[PDB]
Ligand binder design. Structure first.
Ligand SMILES: Nc1ncnc2c1ncn2[C@@H]1O[C@H](COP(=O)(O)OP(=O)(O)OP(O)(O)=S)[C@@H](O)[C@H]1O
Ligand SMILES: Nc1ncnc2c1ncn2[C@@H]1O[C@H](COP(=O)(O)OP(=O)(O)OP(O)(O)=S)[C@@H](O)[C@H]1O
Lengths: 727, 189
């Protein structure tokens, strides 16, 4: 008999003896493959390149058939975390002598700082089979150094992960350096650490405590008269760093790790999926300091009140409950789960005694994004060129909605942009030499829209504020809501007020409401969602309200956002209430959501309507849409600006068409009519001659004689009465 | 409480009362009760007034002084089906009208707390009377708008001043007197 994939454990000694590069193994494993004690053999994770080590027979009286025990030196090379499955194999080739080698420290010093070379020689002779990555730590210190470590940083591949060598004193030119990593050109795996996670400092502290105490100080807790926590539940929106924390916990917690990532346990055969959970938990008890990760727990522990849950899933939930309760004697196993939708987990698993402890991973704020970007950019400091922390703080300020995955994508796209630009100067430029100037991160932001916004497909032609002629008070009041609350948060805080977060734009048809919406989308800088009501309505009961909840949820997933309710009056029910069963629920849901964002959040709601007084008073009160602005017909200057914007590509100067006279003639026009006048003039010019160069006053006369004034005294009176409905 | 599938709304209401049985004394709060009984009883009585049926059944089962009481709110009083206002059900009514001069001044004092109104000479007793007919939230809004007027003038503000309150006042509009002070005076009768 010969197991397929053996389990890693430590060889109990950590004195850095002669064994530091041996692999204690059960006799049958060596013999069945005809390996012998002292012979070299390969160890590696399933499907990866191998790691060379020295085989050695263990104590069959105690040592199980399935266990291969390695050294902290060997495990450093491949980042073998206690409990991963190894695909051991025999080896047939002897590596040469390490002609050139270097040794350093993970903590950044030179080994020339504390200890003489003799103990270094002895230690690296105990290694024997030299290769990069053999960290070893906790030696004696010649000085009173608070800590120490040593690492073989480089040396000079038969499906091997590291390039192995053999020690031969003197011939192997061993130098010494400040280096902490191993040579990247080898691409040995690198362990993650809590120093890479940024922004989540407090969550990290809580999780570190909750994992430190149960595994490594259980006896202490029990004296306080309560049983220890035994389940932790990480949750939050996708892309915030849960799985990263799970892998960092695996690397940093010196405990045996078992994983159930998704439905990796389900089986064809009727009973065997339960056997999988029971086996995992039994093996976690075998090596009592251990952690079991259940990532994407909702995929295997569904709610069962959601009747979509199958029999397999109910049987899995029942077994997992009886196991979690059955972690008897208050041992040292800790079960950490991660889920982006914790409410889909069966409540039986969140009861006290089950996953009672929960850590919420929130969306980064500006400071959190600054921390994440500083950490991510500190990994590339020699190629950075955005070295100013001011520049990184600018990028953090501009990246509204980025969640932590999006920031890493931003850095990746910045690398790509820098390569594109550099390679644009020479087809064979040294691509490794290019460095990431801020301009390239700014260019990358154009492509990397937040992942929370990928369900918002909108064409959105590009329109700037300068295109919206002569609405200056509207522009100022939109600044006040879109930019000032973000650039002046501290002044609001000290004054003790929240900025208004709703505005209603009303006015005659043609005046720039939707144009202001497009301008906000183009130049607000923050995320933009639009609901073209009555787009939300749906046949089935509850679907119309679920649409409002979903759009407000995505606006809440975007962090700073702008929900533009075009024709909001379509959602406000009718006066007579005739068959408005669905509409009433729609308006109540909309009000409940505007009240949900009313507290603690900074979403801004913009609404545009042509019938200002047919929308419910509950939806116009402050807290709901606060500000009302009358987007009225352009005055003389506004029409002059529109005429310039339109006729700029006409040769007006030589043509002699004086735009001021047009502005005088066009009194009463809406902006749409002023634009149509220019379009009609251009059509007249083109129809007169297909090779037009100039549009001249006869064409504008022709266009003018055909354009009506859609605005009437009645409409203007109505919109100037809406401001006075109170009396 | 409303779901696409058949009968899931009824189950939800009965389950809400079931869970409500858990304690006493206890207030059940039906905000915007007018959107629980909007129609299908007075009109459009086709097949889907079950939610009203269930709620109006439950409202009777609760004992008169066992410990549970029920509070509701509405700004559309006549949209509430008369079935709910039958005595024994919900017949008691309290009017929450626009604040009087002294109430508005208390709101102003609270929401202008960190404004140095004393140093700037912003005499609240002028704002409290100028803001007559301002219904609650609008008194609060007038103070947010004053602050924004202050910040836009010179970011890094120390205090807000009367001219900012003038700018705020000139931009706020009130409610409808043929709908407010009416349709509630009538509902009082
Ligand atoms: N501070 C950080 N927060 C989050 N992600 C970070 C951070 N720093 C770097 N990252 C990277 O962002 C990604 C985070 O991993 P994810 O798997 O996206 O975490 P998660 O998406 O929140 O968990 P899921 O969606 O349930 S698998 C990885 O590619 C990390 O390298
Ligand atoms: N300064 C401006 N003021 C008004 N309209 C302008 C201005 N500049 C351009 N336009 C034109 O305005 C048109 C669109 O105006 P909209 O904002 O969509 O009007 P509207 O408010 O949506 O009217 P409704 O929705 O029917 S009540 C486009 O054809 C623009 O070319």
């Amino acid at each position: 008999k010969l197991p397929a994939e053996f389990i890693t454990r430590p060889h109990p000694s950590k004195d850095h003896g002669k064994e530091t590069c041996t692999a204690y193994i059960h006799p049958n494993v060596l013999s069945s493959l005809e390996i012998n004690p002292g012979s070299f053999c390969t160890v590696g994770k399933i499907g990866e390149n191998g790691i060379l080590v020295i085989a050695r027979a263990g104590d069959e009286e105690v040592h199980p058939v399935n266990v291969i025990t390695l050294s902290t030196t060997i495990r450093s090379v491949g980042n073998l975390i206690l409990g991963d499955r190894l695909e051991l194999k025999k080896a047939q080739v002897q590596p040469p002598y390490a002609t050139k080698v270097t040794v350093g420290s993970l903590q950044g010093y030179n080994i020339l700082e504390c200890m003489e070379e003799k103990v270094i020689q002895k230690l690296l002779d105990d290694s024997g089979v030299i290769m990069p990555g053999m960290i070893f730590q906790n030696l004696k210190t010649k000085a009173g150094d608070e800590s120490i470590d040593v690492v073989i940083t480089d040396a000079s591949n038969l499906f091997y992960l590291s390039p192995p060598f053999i020690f031969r004193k003197g011939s192997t030119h061993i130098t010494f350096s400040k280096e902490t990593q191993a040579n990247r050109k080898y691409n040995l795996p690198e362990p993650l650490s809590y120093a890479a996670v940024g922004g989540l400092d407090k969550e990290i502290e809580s999780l570190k405590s909750a994992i430190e105490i149960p595994l490594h100080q259980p006896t202490l807790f029990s004296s306080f008269g309560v049983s220890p926590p035994r389940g932790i539940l990480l949750h939050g929106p996708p892309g915030t760093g849960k799985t990263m924390l799970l892998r960092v916990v695996a690397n940093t917690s010196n405990a045996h790790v078992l994983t159930i990532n998704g439905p990796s346990i389900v089986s064809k055969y009727l009973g065997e999926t339960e056997a999988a959970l029971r086996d995992i938990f039994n093996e976690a008890r075998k090596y009592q300091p251990s952690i079991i990760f259940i990532d994407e727990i909702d995929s295997i522990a569904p709610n069962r009140a959601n009747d979509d849950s199958g029999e397999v899933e109910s049987r899995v939930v029942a077994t997992l409950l009886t196991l979690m309760d059955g972690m008897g004697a208050a041992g040292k196993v800790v079960v950490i789960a991660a889920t982006n939708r914790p409410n889909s987990v069966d409540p039986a698993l969140r009861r006290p005694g089950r996953f009672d402890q929960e850590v919420e991973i929130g969306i980064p704020d500006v400071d959190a994004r600054f921390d994440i970007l500083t950490k991510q950019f500190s990994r590339m400091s020699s190629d950075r060129h955005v070295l100013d922390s001011e520049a990184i703080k600018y990028i953090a300020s501009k990246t509204h909605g980025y969640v932590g995955a999006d920031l890493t994508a931003l850095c990746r796209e910045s690398v790509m942009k820098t390569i594109q630009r550099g390679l644009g100067t020479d087809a064979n430029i040294d691509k490794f030499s290019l460095k990431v100037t801020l301009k390239d991160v700014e260019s990358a932001m154009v492509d990397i829209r937040p992942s929370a916004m990928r369900e918002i497909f909108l064409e959105m032609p590009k329109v700037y504020w300068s295109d919206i002629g002569g609405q200056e008070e509207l522009k100022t009041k939109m600044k006040e809501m879109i930019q000032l609350p973000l650039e002046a948060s501290e002044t609001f805080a000290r004054l003790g007020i929240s900025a208004p977060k709703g505005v209603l734009l009303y006015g005659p048809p043609g005046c720039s409401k939707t144009l202001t919406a497009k301008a906000l989308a183009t130049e607000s800088g923050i995320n933009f969602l639009a609901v073209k009501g009555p787009e939300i309505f749906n046949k089935y009961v509850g679907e119309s309200e679920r649409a409002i909840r979903e759009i407000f949820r995505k606006a809440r997933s975007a962090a700073p956002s702008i929900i533009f309710f075009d024709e909001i009056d379509a959602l406000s029910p009718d006066r007579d209430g005739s068959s408005t069963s669905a509409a009433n629920h729609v308006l109540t849901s909309l009000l409940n959501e505007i009240d949900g964002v009313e507290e603690l959040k900074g979403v801004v709601i913009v609404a545009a309507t042509n019938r200002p007084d047919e929308i419910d008073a509950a939806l116009l009160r402050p807290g709901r849409l606060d500000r009302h602005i009358y987007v009225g017909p352009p005055d003389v200057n506004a029409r002059l600006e529109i005429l310039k914007k339109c006729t700029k590509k006409f040769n007006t100067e030589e043509s002699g068409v004086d735009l001021h006279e047009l502005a005088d003639r066009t009194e009463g026009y809406s902006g749409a009519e002023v634009v149509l006048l220019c379009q009609e003039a251009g059509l007249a010019a083109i129809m007169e001659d297909l090779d037009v160069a100039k549009v001249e006053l006869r064409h504008f006369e022709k266009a003018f004689k055909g354009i009506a004034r859609g605005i009437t005294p009645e409409m203007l009176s109505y919109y100037e009465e809406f401001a006075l409905r109170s009396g």
